[PDB]
């Protein structure tokens, strides 16, 4: 309540202390910051109306988001003023993607509070999930009045991007992969620390879920988990194209079934799927509707046979050889 209460009384404009930060820039970003907000207001309100249909609420949502945007900006730029050279600080303030991400995240907090939720705001602003993902942790750190429920919501957004959204076709992620840590650092990157940190968090997320299912399904073969994880991590690292337009948990379940298969262990997909459902956010569509080729979808069993196996045949077989591949680090 404390945050929304502040926003209802807060200024619609940048404070003088935030303007003071603007003045310290070699290239004064203020004019472009104000115009960006005004122009985004117009697009936001229209797309809002187009969404909800006929019936002011739209204008107030944007107004509150803008107020929070300026609040968190000022808070975030206090730390960054110490951390960045004069040149980079100016570069950050004139960075469109930084501002759009900061604004999107503020709008998401207001939308979710007065609940069209994630990822609706990304399509409104034409903003890639991977670019938005860069701001979340620093946003949370810069806004001390966020409620537990909102932090959890933003963390949920972050994890949805990590598990699916960042892997959609056209995602900037694949460009970074082809090539090869505050929000400011990651937006200052040219056209990788964004890549490194993203993968580290994905690995952490992925092992957590694998651990859970393994502990419930393969206790009598406890050797299996680390082996399954090595297949999982290797595939995320080296066969990343399998993730494109698909879901982290699909590669997880296939790695389990795949490893158990080549160990001659009876673990039906049916048993795997059933345990998956008890995962805190798990949704039956993830194993029922899996992309195969050129927009045709089927169950996970078909995906495993037609795509997963055919790409990873030689890889999985090594885990049954006399020289199985070296176990992967646990994150």
PDB file of C-alpha atoms in Angstrom:
ATOM      1  CA  UNK A   1       0.000   0.000   0.000  1.00  0.00           C
ATOM      2  CA  UNK A   2       2.829   2.393   0.882  1.00  0.00           C
ATOM      3  CA  UNK A   3       4.084   2.535  -2.751  1.00  0.00           C
ATOM      4  CA  UNK A   4       0.735   3.167  -4.487  1.00  0.00           C
ATOM      5  CA  UNK A   5      -0.065   5.799  -1.869  1.00  0.00           C
ATOM      6  CA  UNK A   6       3.168   7.571  -2.813  1.00  0.00           C
ATOM      7  CA  UNK A   7       2.359   7.337  -6.537  1.00  0.00           C
ATOM      8  CA  UNK A   8      -1.108   8.898  -6.064  1.00  0.00           C
ATOM      9  CA  UNK A   9       0.582  11.938  -4.489  1.00  0.00           C
ATOM     10  CA  UNK A  10       3.762  11.800  -6.587  1.00  0.00           C
ATOM     11  CA  UNK A  11       4.812  14.269  -9.272  1.00  0.00           C
ATOM     12  CA  UNK A  12       4.093  13.598 -12.946  1.00  0.00           C
ATOM     13  CA  UNK A  13       7.512  15.148 -13.648  1.00  0.00           C
ATOM     14  CA  UNK A  14      11.211  14.443 -12.963  1.00  0.00           C
ATOM     15  CA  UNK A  15      12.294  15.919  -9.622  1.00  0.00           C
ATOM     16  CA  UNK A  16      15.020  18.586  -9.532  1.00  0.00           C
ATOM     17  CA  UNK A  17      17.451  16.013  -8.189  1.00  0.00           C
ATOM     18  CA  UNK A  18      16.698  13.804 -11.171  1.00  0.00           C
ATOM     19  CA  UNK A  19      17.074  16.851 -13.407  1.00  0.00           C
ATOM     20  CA  UNK A  20      20.368  17.502 -11.634  1.00  0.00           C
ATOM     21  CA  UNK A  21      21.450  14.026 -12.827  1.00  0.00           C
ATOM     22  CA  UNK A  22      20.275  14.973 -16.332  1.00  0.00           C
ATOM     23  CA  UNK A  23      22.436  18.100 -16.224  1.00  0.00           C
ATOM     24  CA  UNK A  24      25.558  16.087 -15.364  1.00  0.00           C
ATOM     25  CA  UNK A  25      25.219  14.382 -18.760  1.00  0.00           C
ATOM     26  CA  UNK A  26      27.490  15.403 -21.632  1.00  0.00           C
ATOM     27  CA  UNK A  27      24.456  14.985 -23.856  1.00  0.00           C
ATOM     28  CA  UNK A  28      21.411  16.284 -21.957  1.00  0.00           C
ATOM     29  CA  UNK A  29      18.878  13.412 -22.278  1.00  0.00           C
ATOM     30  CA  UNK A  30      15.945  15.281 -20.682  1.00  0.00           C
ATOM     31  CA  UNK A  31      14.233  16.467 -23.858  1.00  0.00           C
ATOM     32  CA  UNK A  32      14.357  12.971 -25.339  1.00  0.00           C
ATOM     33  CA  UNK A  33      13.186  11.439 -22.034  1.00  0.00           C
ATOM     34  CA  UNK A  34      10.096  13.667 -21.868  1.00  0.00           C
ATOM     35  CA  UNK A  35       9.165  13.145 -25.506  1.00  0.00           C
ATOM     36  CA  UNK A  36       9.623   9.399 -25.148  1.00  0.00           C
ATOM     37  CA  UNK A  37       7.080   9.364 -22.320  1.00  0.00           C
ATOM     38  CA  UNK A  38       4.531  11.564 -24.108  1.00  0.00           C
ATOM     39  CA  UNK A  39       4.744   9.473 -27.326  1.00  0.00           C
ATOM     40  CA  UNK A  40       4.554   6.185 -25.408  1.00  0.00           C
ATOM     41  CA  UNK A  41       1.512   7.516 -23.537  1.00  0.00           C
ATOM     42  CA  UNK A  42      -0.334   7.819 -26.838  1.00  0.00           C
ATOM     43  CA  UNK A  43       0.459   4.260 -27.942  1.00  0.00           C
ATOM     44  CA  UNK A  44      -0.251   2.812 -24.486  1.00  0.00           C
ATOM     45  CA  UNK A  45      -3.693   4.372 -24.128  1.00  0.00           C
ATOM     46  CA  UNK A  46      -4.788   3.306 -27.615  1.00  0.00           C
ATOM     47  CA  UNK A  47      -3.562  -0.262 -27.222  1.00  0.00           C
ATOM     48  CA  UNK A  48      -5.226  -0.337 -23.833  1.00  0.00           C
ATOM     49  CA  UNK A  49      -8.593   0.730 -25.272  1.00  0.00           C
ATOM     50  CA  UNK A  50      -8.189  -1.770 -28.116  1.00  0.00           C
ATOM     51  CA  UNK A  51      -7.663  -4.420 -25.436  1.00  0.00           C
ATOM     52  CA  UNK A  52     -10.385  -3.733 -22.866  1.00  0.00           C
ATOM     53  CA  UNK A  53     -12.906  -2.377 -25.356  1.00  0.00           C
ATOM     54  CA  UNK A  54     -15.060   0.710 -24.772  1.00  0.00           C
ATOM     55  CA  UNK A  55     -15.672   2.485 -21.456  1.00  0.00           C
ATOM     56  CA  UNK A  56      -9.766   7.199 -18.414  1.00  0.00           C
ATOM     57  CA  UNK A  57      -8.671   4.095 -16.498  1.00  0.00           C
ATOM     58  CA  UNK A  58      -6.148   3.625 -19.315  1.00  0.00           C
ATOM     59  CA  UNK A  59      -4.794   7.159 -18.807  1.00  0.00           C
ATOM     60  CA  UNK A  60      -4.444   6.717 -15.045  1.00  0.00           C
ATOM     61  CA  UNK A  61      -2.575   3.448 -15.381  1.00  0.00           C
ATOM     62  CA  UNK A  62       0.003   5.186 -17.578  1.00  0.00           C
ATOM     63  CA  UNK A  63       0.161   8.203 -15.285  1.00  0.00           C
ATOM     64  CA  UNK A  64       0.954   6.037 -12.237  1.00  0.00           C
ATOM     65  CA  UNK A  65       3.529   4.020 -14.175  1.00  0.00           C
ATOM     66  CA  UNK A  66       5.257   7.194 -15.302  1.00  0.00           C
ATOM     67  CA  UNK A  67       5.366   8.431 -11.704  1.00  0.00           C
ATOM     68  CA  UNK A  68       6.999   5.187 -10.590  1.00  0.00           C
ATOM     69  CA  UNK A  69       9.339   5.261 -13.601  1.00  0.00           C
ATOM     70  CA  UNK A  70      10.750   8.627 -12.492  1.00  0.00           C
ATOM     71  CA  UNK A  71      10.950   7.481  -8.878  1.00  0.00           C
ATOM     72  CA  UNK A  72      12.916   4.300  -9.578  1.00  0.00           C
ATOM     73  CA  UNK A  73      15.068   6.072 -12.194  1.00  0.00           C
ATOM     74  CA  UNK A  74      16.232   8.617  -9.618  1.00  0.00           C
ATOM     75  CA  UNK A  75      16.878   5.832  -7.100  1.00  0.00           C
ATOM     76  CA  UNK A  76      18.807   3.702  -9.627  1.00  0.00           C
ATOM     77  CA  UNK A  77      20.907   6.617 -10.947  1.00  0.00           C
ATOM     78  CA  UNK A  78      22.174   7.403  -7.450  1.00  0.00           C
ATOM     79  CA  UNK A  79      24.196   4.171  -7.381  1.00  0.00           C
ATOM     80  CA  UNK A  80      25.164   4.359 -11.046  1.00  0.00           C
ATOM     81  CA  UNK A  81      26.596   7.881 -10.593  1.00  0.00           C
ATOM     82  CA  UNK A  82      29.347   6.353  -8.430  1.00  0.00           C
ATOM     83  CA  UNK A  83      29.872   3.359 -10.710  1.00  0.00           C
ATOM     84  CA  UNK A  84      30.038   4.866 -14.187  1.00  0.00           C
ATOM     85  CA  UNK A  85      32.389   7.208 -16.024  1.00  0.00           C
ATOM     86  CA  UNK A  86      30.893  10.569 -17.012  1.00  0.00           C
ATOM     87  CA  UNK A  87      30.745   9.278 -20.604  1.00  0.00           C
ATOM     88  CA  UNK A  88      28.925   6.039 -19.797  1.00  0.00           C
ATOM     89  CA  UNK A  89      26.483   7.755 -17.439  1.00  0.00           C
ATOM     90  CA  UNK A  90      25.504  10.040 -20.326  1.00  0.00           C
ATOM     91  CA  UNK A  91      25.292   7.021 -22.632  1.00  0.00           C
ATOM     92  CA  UNK A  92      22.958   5.226 -20.231  1.00  0.00           C
ATOM     93  CA  UNK A  93      20.599   8.202 -20.006  1.00  0.00           C
ATOM     94  CA  UNK A  94      20.359   8.468 -23.785  1.00  0.00           C
ATOM     95  CA  UNK A  95      19.785   4.759 -24.195  1.00  0.00           C
ATOM     96  CA  UNK A  96      16.289   4.139 -25.552  1.00  0.00           C
ATOM     97  CA  UNK A  97      16.142   0.468 -24.634  1.00  0.00           C
ATOM     98  CA  UNK A  98      17.176   1.207 -21.047  1.00  0.00           C
ATOM     99  CA  UNK A  99      14.372   3.775 -20.706  1.00  0.00           C
ATOM    100  CA  UNK A 100      11.718   1.623 -22.387  1.00  0.00           C
ATOM    101  CA  UNK A 101      12.654  -1.299 -20.143  1.00  0.00           C
ATOM    102  CA  UNK A 102      12.564   0.840 -17.008  1.00  0.00           C
ATOM    103  CA  UNK A 103       9.207   2.290 -18.066  1.00  0.00           C
ATOM    104  CA  UNK A 104       7.785  -1.137 -19.027  1.00  0.00           C
ATOM    105  CA  UNK A 105       8.729  -2.508 -15.636  1.00  0.00           C
ATOM    106  CA  UNK A 106       7.092   0.404 -13.811  1.00  0.00           C
ATOM    107  CA  UNK A 107       3.931  -0.053 -15.907  1.00  0.00           C
ATOM    108  CA  UNK A 108       3.965  -3.781 -15.174  1.00  0.00           C
ATOM    109  CA  UNK A 109       3.974  -3.098 -11.436  1.00  0.00           C
ATOM    110  CA  UNK A 110       0.989  -0.754 -11.741  1.00  0.00           C
ATOM    111  CA  UNK A 111      -0.941  -3.131 -14.077  1.00  0.00           C
ATOM    112  CA  UNK A 112      -0.355  -6.135 -11.851  1.00  0.00           C
ATOM    113  CA  UNK A 113      -1.271  -4.220  -8.712  1.00  0.00           C
ATOM    114  CA  UNK A 114      -4.603  -2.972 -10.004  1.00  0.00           C
ATOM    115  CA  UNK A 115      -5.425  -6.196 -11.830  1.00  0.00           C
ATOM    116  CA  UNK A 116      -3.432  -7.921 -19.768  1.00  0.00           C
ATOM    117  CA  UNK A 117      -0.599  -8.807 -17.402  1.00  0.00           C
ATOM    118  CA  UNK A 118       2.845  -9.981 -18.517  1.00  0.00           C
ATOM    119  CA  UNK A 119       3.795 -10.228 -21.346  1.00  0.00           C
ATOM    120  CA  UNK A 120       1.148  -7.826 -22.638  1.00  0.00           C
ATOM    121  CA  UNK A 121       3.305  -4.743 -21.903  1.00  0.00           C
ATOM    122  CA  UNK A 122       6.149  -6.039 -24.125  1.00  0.00           C
ATOM    123  CA  UNK A 123       4.005  -6.215 -27.254  1.00  0.00           C
ATOM    124  CA  UNK A 124       2.575  -2.778 -26.484  1.00  0.00           C
ATOM    125  CA  UNK A 125       6.070  -1.264 -26.408  1.00  0.00           C
ATOM    126  CA  UNK A 126       7.487  -3.570 -29.065  1.00  0.00           C
ATOM    127  CA  UNK A 127      10.086  -4.634 -26.445  1.00  0.00           C
ATOM    128  CA  UNK A 128      12.008  -7.936 -26.576  1.00  0.00           C
ATOM    129  CA  UNK A 129      11.724 -10.072 -23.428  1.00  0.00           C
ATOM    130  CA  UNK A 130      15.503 -10.438 -23.200  1.00  0.00           C
ATOM    131  CA  UNK A 131      15.953  -6.653 -23.180  1.00  0.00           C
ATOM    132  CA  UNK A 132      13.292  -6.215 -20.531  1.00  0.00           C
ATOM    133  CA  UNK A 133      14.828  -9.047 -18.465  1.00  0.00           C
ATOM    134  CA  UNK A 134      17.972  -6.913 -18.010  1.00  0.00           C
ATOM    135  CA  UNK A 135      16.211  -4.324 -15.807  1.00  0.00           C
ATOM    136  CA  UNK A 136      14.264  -6.515 -13.365  1.00  0.00           C
ATOM    137  CA  UNK A 137      16.830  -7.234 -10.637  1.00  0.00           C
ATOM    138  CA  UNK A 138      18.107  -3.628 -10.523  1.00  0.00           C
ATOM    139  CA  UNK A 139      14.532  -2.333 -10.571  1.00  0.00           C
ATOM    140  CA  UNK A 140      13.682  -4.433  -7.504  1.00  0.00           C
ATOM    141  CA  UNK A 141      16.864  -3.255  -5.754  1.00  0.00           C
ATOM    142  CA  UNK A 142      16.038   0.388  -6.527  1.00  0.00           C
ATOM    143  CA  UNK A 143      12.449   0.253  -5.226  1.00  0.00           C
ATOM    144  CA  UNK A 144      12.461  -0.532  -1.514  1.00  0.00           C
ATOM    145  CA  UNK A 145       8.691  -0.083  -1.180  1.00  0.00           C
ATOM    146  CA  UNK A 146       7.770  -2.997  -3.450  1.00  0.00           C
ATOM    147  CA  UNK A 147       5.589  -5.533  -1.643  1.00  0.00           C
ATOM    148  CA  UNK A 148       6.567  -9.185  -1.313  1.00  0.00           C
ATOM    149  CA  UNK A 149       3.755 -10.062  -3.698  1.00  0.00           C
ATOM    150  CA  UNK A 150       5.078  -7.642  -6.340  1.00  0.00           C
ATOM    151  CA  UNK A 151       8.687  -8.802  -6.011  1.00  0.00           C
ATOM    152  CA  UNK A 152       7.398 -12.337  -6.490  1.00  0.00           C
ATOM    153  CA  UNK A 153       5.427 -11.200  -9.520  1.00  0.00           C
ATOM    154  CA  UNK A 154       8.508  -9.585 -11.100  1.00  0.00           C
ATOM    155  CA  UNK A 155      10.620 -12.655 -10.224  1.00  0.00           C
ATOM    156  CA  UNK A 156       7.910 -14.699 -11.893  1.00  0.00           C
ATOM    157  CA  UNK A 157       8.213 -12.514 -14.999  1.00  0.00           C
ATOM    158  CA  UNK A 158      11.979 -12.967 -14.971  1.00  0.00           C
ATOM    159  CA  UNK A 159      11.630 -16.752 -14.786  1.00  0.00           C
ATOM    160  CA  UNK A 160       9.027 -16.887 -17.557  1.00  0.00           C
ATOM    161  CA  UNK A 161      11.500 -14.973 -19.782  1.00  0.00           C
ATOM    162  CA  UNK A 162      14.255 -17.388 -18.752  1.00  0.00           C
ATOM    163  CA  UNK A 163      12.144 -20.466 -19.454  1.00  0.00           C
ATOM    164  CA  UNK A 164      10.411 -19.454 -22.687  1.00  0.00           C
ATOM    165  CA  UNK A 165      10.181 -15.810 -23.818  1.00  0.00           C
ATOM    166  CA  UNK A 166      13.906 -15.180 -24.317  1.00  0.00           C
ATOM    167  CA  UNK A 167      14.061 -18.208 -26.623  1.00  0.00           C
ATOM    168  CA  UNK A 168      11.405 -17.085 -29.096  1.00  0.00           C
ATOM    169  CA  UNK A 169      12.484 -16.583 -32.724  1.00  0.00           C
ATOM    170  CA  UNK A 170      14.083 -13.177 -33.369  1.00  0.00           C
ATOM    171  CA  UNK A 171      15.169 -12.922 -29.719  1.00  0.00           C
ATOM    172  CA  UNK A 172      18.385 -10.885 -29.262  1.00  0.00           C
ATOM    173  CA  UNK A 173      19.613 -13.880 -27.183  1.00  0.00           C
ATOM    174  CA  UNK A 174      20.361 -16.041 -30.228  1.00  0.00           C
ATOM    175  CA  UNK A 175      22.440 -13.236 -31.725  1.00  0.00           C
ATOM    176  CA  UNK A 176      24.525 -13.133 -28.549  1.00  0.00           C
ATOM    177  CA  UNK A 177      24.830 -16.927 -28.567  1.00  0.00           C
ATOM    178  CA  UNK A 178      25.981 -16.851 -32.232  1.00  0.00           C
ATOM    179  CA  UNK A 179      28.708 -14.381 -31.255  1.00  0.00           C
ATOM    180  CA  UNK A 180      30.370 -16.264 -28.387  1.00  0.00           C
ATOM    181  CA  UNK A 181      26.304  -6.722 -13.799  1.00  0.00           C
ATOM    182  CA  UNK A 182      23.689  -4.109 -12.948  1.00  0.00           C
ATOM    183  CA  UNK A 183      20.948  -3.249 -15.404  1.00  0.00           C
ATOM    184  CA  UNK A 184      23.097  -0.263 -16.433  1.00  0.00           C
ATOM    185  CA  UNK A 185      26.085  -2.469 -17.263  1.00  0.00           C
ATOM    186  CA  UNK A 186      23.963  -4.763 -19.428  1.00  0.00           C
ATOM    187  CA  UNK A 187      22.309  -1.916 -21.379  1.00  0.00           C
ATOM    188  CA  UNK A 188      25.681  -0.239 -21.941  1.00  0.00           C
ATOM    189  CA  UNK A 189      26.962  -3.288 -23.872  1.00  0.00           C
ATOM    190  CA  UNK A 190      27.479  -2.548 -27.593  1.00  0.00           C
ATOM    191  CA  UNK A 191      26.027  -4.530 -30.502  1.00  0.00           C
ATOM    192  CA  UNK A 192      29.008 -10.866 -23.139  1.00  0.00           C
ATOM    193  CA  UNK A 193      28.073 -10.107 -19.532  1.00  0.00           C
ATOM    194  CA  UNK A 194      24.352 -10.114 -20.280  1.00  0.00           C
ATOM    195  CA  UNK A 195      24.798 -13.513 -21.886  1.00  0.00           C
ATOM    196  CA  UNK A 196      26.932 -14.901 -19.030  1.00  0.00           C
ATOM    197  CA  UNK A 197      24.609 -13.831 -16.245  1.00  0.00           C
ATOM    198  CA  UNK A 198      21.536 -14.921 -18.186  1.00  0.00           C
ATOM    199  CA  UNK A 199      22.920 -18.424 -18.667  1.00  0.00           C
ATOM    200  CA  UNK A 200      24.050 -18.648 -15.043  1.00  0.00           C
ATOM    201  CA  UNK A 201      20.548 -17.860 -13.812  1.00  0.00           C
ATOM    202  CA  UNK A 202      18.978 -20.211 -16.359  1.00  0.00           C
ATOM    203  CA  UNK A 203      21.267 -23.023 -15.185  1.00  0.00           C
ATOM    204  CA  UNK A 204      20.317 -22.333 -11.565  1.00  0.00           C
ATOM    205  CA  UNK A 205      16.605 -22.356 -12.452  1.00  0.00           C
ATOM    206  CA  UNK A 206      16.881 -25.498 -14.582  1.00  0.00           C
ATOM    207  CA  UNK A 207      18.802 -27.585 -12.033  1.00  0.00           C
ATOM    208  CA  UNK A 208      16.350 -26.625  -9.234  1.00  0.00           C
ATOM    209  CA  UNK A 209      13.427 -28.083 -11.172  1.00  0.00           C
ATOM    210  CA  UNK A 210      15.397 -31.118 -12.323  1.00  0.00           C
ATOM    211  CA  UNK A 211      16.485 -31.773  -8.753  1.00  0.00           C
ATOM    212  CA  UNK A 212      12.871 -31.781  -7.584  1.00  0.00           C
ATOM    213  CA  UNK A 213      11.609 -34.258 -10.186  1.00  0.00           C
ATOM    214  CA  UNK A 214      14.663 -36.492  -9.819  1.00  0.00           C
ATOM    215  CA  UNK A 215      14.322 -36.723  -6.020  1.00  0.00           C
ATOM    216  CA  UNK A 216      10.700 -37.808  -6.451  1.00  0.00           C
ATOM    217  CA  UNK A 217      11.156 -40.226  -9.352  1.00  0.00           C
ATOM    218  CA  UNK A 218      14.665 -41.690  -9.275  1.00  0.00           C
ATOM    219  CA  UNK A 219      15.622 -42.159  -5.636  1.00  0.00           C
ATOM    220  CA  UNK A 220      16.496 -45.835  -6.233  1.00  0.00           C
ATOM    221  CA  UNK A 221      18.923 -44.752  -8.962  1.00  0.00           C
ATOM    222  CA  UNK A 222      20.498 -41.655  -7.359  1.00  0.00           C
ATOM    223  CA  UNK A 223      23.444 -41.736  -9.767  1.00  0.00           C
ATOM    224  CA  UNK A 224      21.083 -40.604 -12.522  1.00  0.00           C
ATOM    225  CA  UNK A 225      20.471 -36.960 -11.574  1.00  0.00           C
ATOM    226  CA  UNK A 226      23.968 -35.586 -12.183  1.00  0.00           C
ATOM    227  CA  UNK A 227      24.120 -37.519 -15.453  1.00  0.00           C
ATOM    228  CA  UNK A 228      20.735 -36.142 -16.515  1.00  0.00           C
ATOM    229  CA  UNK A 229      21.914 -32.648 -15.555  1.00  0.00           C
ATOM    230  CA  UNK A 230      25.072 -32.995 -17.664  1.00  0.00           C
ATOM    231  CA  UNK A 231      22.905 -33.900 -20.674  1.00  0.00           C
ATOM    232  CA  UNK A 232      20.557 -31.000 -19.884  1.00  0.00           C
ATOM    233  CA  UNK A 233      23.288 -28.397 -19.438  1.00  0.00           C
ATOM    234  CA  UNK A 234      25.240 -29.608 -22.491  1.00  0.00           C
ATOM    235  CA  UNK A 235      22.097 -29.286 -24.623  1.00  0.00           C
ATOM    236  CA  UNK A 236      21.308 -25.785 -23.345  1.00  0.00           C
ATOM    237  CA  UNK A 237      24.925 -24.831 -23.999  1.00  0.00           C
ATOM    238  CA  UNK A 238      25.625 -26.515 -27.349  1.00  0.00           C
ATOM    239  CA  UNK A 239      22.281 -27.461 -28.883  1.00  0.00           C
ATOM    240  CA  UNK A 240      20.465 -24.211 -28.017  1.00  0.00           C
ATOM    241  CA  UNK A 241      18.428 -24.288 -31.247  1.00  0.00           C
ATOM    242  CA  UNK A 242      16.203 -26.894 -29.591  1.00  0.00           C
ATOM    243  CA  UNK A 243      15.102 -24.126 -27.188  1.00  0.00           C
ATOM    244  CA  UNK A 244      13.981 -21.813 -29.998  1.00  0.00           C
ATOM    245  CA  UNK A 245      10.202 -21.350 -29.727  1.00  0.00           C
ATOM    246  CA  UNK A 246      10.087 -23.993 -26.986  1.00  0.00           C
ATOM    247  CA  UNK A 247      10.152 -24.331 -23.192  1.00  0.00           C
ATOM    248  CA  UNK A 248      12.976 -25.062 -20.742  1.00  0.00           C
ATOM    249  CA  UNK A 249      10.939 -27.780 -18.998  1.00  0.00           C
ATOM    250  CA  UNK A 250      10.456 -29.657 -22.286  1.00  0.00           C
ATOM    251  CA  UNK A 251      14.227 -30.077 -22.687  1.00  0.00           C
ATOM    252  CA  UNK A 252      14.315 -31.072 -18.997  1.00  0.00           C
ATOM    253  CA  UNK A 253      11.794 -33.897 -19.269  1.00  0.00           C
ATOM    254  CA  UNK A 254      13.333 -35.204 -22.489  1.00  0.00           C
ATOM    255  CA  UNK A 255      16.792 -35.324 -20.932  1.00  0.00           C
ATOM    256  CA  UNK A 256      15.418 -37.450 -18.080  1.00  0.00           C
ATOM    257  CA  UNK A 257      13.608 -39.879 -20.373  1.00  0.00           C
ATOM    258  CA  UNK A 258      16.580 -39.968 -22.732  1.00  0.00           C
ATOM    259  CA  UNK A 259      19.134 -40.860 -20.079  1.00  0.00           C
ATOM    260  CA  UNK A 260      16.931 -43.507 -18.460  1.00  0.00           C
ATOM    261  CA  UNK A 261      16.299 -45.012 -21.876  1.00  0.00           C
ATOM    262  CA  UNK A 262      19.988 -45.594 -22.621  1.00  0.00           C
ATOM    263  CA  UNK A 263      20.525 -46.965 -19.110  1.00  0.00           C
ATOM    264  CA  UNK A 264      17.786 -49.506 -19.789  1.00  0.00           C
ATOM    265  CA  UNK A 265      15.634 -48.072 -16.988  1.00  0.00           C
ATOM    266  CA  UNK A 266      11.848 -48.229 -16.993  1.00  0.00           C
ATOM    267  CA  UNK A 267      10.786 -44.590 -16.733  1.00  0.00           C
ATOM    268  CA  UNK A 268       7.746 -43.912 -18.903  1.00  0.00           C
ATOM    269  CA  UNK A 269       7.024 -40.330 -20.006  1.00  0.00           C
ATOM    270  CA  UNK A 270       3.612 -40.757 -18.353  1.00  0.00           C
ATOM    271  CA  UNK A 271       5.330 -41.065 -14.983  1.00  0.00           C
ATOM    272  CA  UNK A 272       7.522 -38.055 -15.769  1.00  0.00           C
ATOM    273  CA  UNK A 273       4.605 -35.850 -16.879  1.00  0.00           C
ATOM    274  CA  UNK A 274       2.541 -36.691 -13.780  1.00  0.00           C
ATOM    275  CA  UNK A 275       5.293 -35.578 -11.403  1.00  0.00           C
ATOM    276  CA  UNK A 276       5.838 -32.408 -13.464  1.00  0.00           C
ATOM    277  CA  UNK A 277       2.325 -31.107 -12.699  1.00  0.00           C
ATOM    278  CA  UNK A 278       3.118 -30.673  -8.998  1.00  0.00           C
ATOM    279  CA  UNK A 279       5.836 -28.129  -9.834  1.00  0.00           C
ATOM    280  CA  UNK A 280       4.711 -24.722  -8.435  1.00  0.00           C
ATOM    281  CA  UNK A 281       3.828 -23.035 -11.740  1.00  0.00           C
ATOM    282  CA  UNK A 282       3.607 -26.078 -14.025  1.00  0.00           C
ATOM    283  CA  UNK A 283       0.986 -26.142 -16.770  1.00  0.00           C
ATOM    284  CA  UNK A 284      -0.191 -29.236 -18.685  1.00  0.00           C
ATOM    285  CA  UNK A 285       0.120 -27.445 -22.028  1.00  0.00           C
ATOM    286  CA  UNK A 286       3.917 -27.586 -21.739  1.00  0.00           C
ATOM    287  CA  UNK A 287       3.976 -31.380 -22.334  1.00  0.00           C
ATOM    288  CA  UNK A 288       0.766 -31.573 -24.382  1.00  0.00           C
ATOM    289  CA  UNK A 289       1.702 -28.899 -26.878  1.00  0.00           C
ATOM    290  CA  UNK A 290       5.330 -29.052 -27.974  1.00  0.00           C
ATOM    291  CA  UNK A 291       6.629 -27.535 -31.214  1.00  0.00           C
ATOM    292  CA  UNK A 292       7.960 -30.041 -33.732  1.00  0.00           C
ATOM    293  CA  UNK A 293       8.705 -28.496 -37.121  1.00  0.00           C
ATOM    294  CA  UNK A 294       7.368 -25.516 -39.116  1.00  0.00           C
ATOM    295  CA  UNK A 295       4.502 -24.740 -36.734  1.00  0.00           C
ATOM    296  CA  UNK A 296       3.138 -28.189 -36.028  1.00  0.00           C
ATOM    297  CA  UNK A 297       2.637 -29.167 -32.399  1.00  0.00           C
ATOM    298  CA  UNK A 298       2.295 -32.459 -30.638  1.00  0.00           C
ATOM    299  CA  UNK A 299       2.944 -34.180 -27.340  1.00  0.00           C
ATOM    300  CA  UNK A 300       6.370 -34.373 -25.718  1.00  0.00           C
ATOM    301  CA  UNK A 301       6.682 -38.058 -26.701  1.00  0.00           C
ATOM    302  CA  UNK A 302       6.570 -37.091 -30.387  1.00  0.00           C
ATOM    303  CA  UNK A 303       9.040 -34.228 -29.864  1.00  0.00           C
ATOM    304  CA  UNK A 304      11.488 -36.581 -28.120  1.00  0.00           C
ATOM    305  CA  UNK A 305      11.350 -39.184 -30.935  1.00  0.00           C
ATOM    306  CA  UNK A 306      11.281 -36.887 -33.984  1.00  0.00           C
ATOM    307  CA  UNK A 307      13.437 -33.922 -32.927  1.00  0.00           C
ATOM    308  CA  UNK A 308      15.265 -34.379 -29.595  1.00  0.00           C
ATOM    309  CA  UNK A 309      16.620 -37.898 -30.310  1.00  0.00           C
ATOM    310  CA  UNK A 310      17.496 -37.243 -33.968  1.00  0.00           C
ATOM    311  CA  UNK A 311      19.613 -34.240 -32.941  1.00  0.00           C
ATOM    312  CA  UNK A 312      21.108 -35.759 -29.792  1.00  0.00           C
ATOM    313  CA  UNK A 313      21.470 -39.466 -30.703  1.00  0.00           C
ATOM    314  CA  UNK A 314      25.271 -39.575 -30.678  1.00  0.00           C
ATOM    315  CA  UNK A 315      25.307 -37.426 -27.528  1.00  0.00           C
ATOM    316  CA  UNK A 316      23.012 -39.546 -25.377  1.00  0.00           C
ATOM    317  CA  UNK A 317      24.692 -42.799 -26.411  1.00  0.00           C
ATOM    318  CA  UNK A 318      27.996 -41.646 -24.870  1.00  0.00           C
ATOM    319  CA  UNK A 319      26.426 -41.864 -21.411  1.00  0.00           C
ATOM    320  CA  UNK A 320      26.281 -45.644 -21.988  1.00  0.00           C
ATOM    321  CA  UNK A 321      29.829 -45.910 -23.288  1.00  0.00           C
ATOM    322  CA  UNK A 322      32.884 -46.984 -21.309  1.00  0.00           C
ATOM    323  CA  UNK A 323      34.003 -43.358 -21.522  1.00  0.00           C
ATOM    324  CA  UNK A 324      30.870 -41.369 -20.562  1.00  0.00           C
ATOM    325  CA  UNK A 325      31.241 -37.581 -20.874  1.00  0.00           C
ATOM    326  CA  UNK A 326      32.534 -35.682 -17.825  1.00  0.00           C
ATOM    327  CA  UNK A 327      29.870 -34.647 -15.258  1.00  0.00           C
ATOM    328  CA  UNK A 328      28.757 -30.998 -15.526  1.00  0.00           C
ATOM    329  CA  UNK A 329      29.178 -28.489 -12.669  1.00  0.00           C
ATOM    330  CA  UNK A 330      26.204 -27.996 -10.374  1.00  0.00           C
ATOM    331  CA  UNK A 331      25.402 -24.236 -10.390  1.00  0.00           C
TER     332      UNK A 331
END
